[PDB]
């Protein structure tokens, strides 16, 4: 809930696990990266794309 | 004869159908073909059993 302070999310589409329910989920050792999308390849960040 | 059936897929071949299609749809097409051939094998072994 603290992640909404900087900017509202634009894409928000998530594959696989549901982003709506995350407080009841348990997991470990997550990876975090950071890069840029110039604007017309937002849908290109998906499996099977070229 | 049922090996050469299309089973609702684009082609009945295996090696050629991998190159022409991307994996996100090739996996679904292969899964459909495998389920159809397994159903045909189930019909064959039921006939053989009776």
From Swiss-Prot, chain A:
Ranges where the record places region Integrin-binding motif: 38-40
Subunit composition and interactions: Binds to host ACE2. RBD also interacts with the N-linked glycan on 'Asn-90' of ACE2. Cleavage of S generates a polybasic C-terminal sequence on S1 that binds to host Neuropilin-1 (NRP1) and Neuropilin-2 (NRP2) receptors. Interacts with host integrin alpha-5/beta-1 (ITGA5:ITGB1) and with ACE2 in complex with integrin alpha-5/beta-1 (ITGA5:ITGB1). May interact via cytoplasmic c-terminus with M protein. May interact (via N-terminus) with host bilirubin and biliverdin, thereby preventing antibody binding to the SARS-CoV-2 spike NTD via an allosteric mechanism.
Function: Attaches the virion to the cell membrane by interacting with host receptor, initiating the infection. The major receptor is host ACE2. When S2/S2' has been cleaved, binding to the receptor triggers direct fusion at the cell membrane. When S2/S2' has not been cleaved, binding to the receptor results in internalization of the virus by endocytosis using host TFRC and GRM2 and leading to fusion of the virion membrane with the host endosomal membrane. Alternatively, may use NRP1/NRP2 and integrin as entry receptors.
Protein name from the UniProt record: Spike protein S1
Name of the coding gene: S
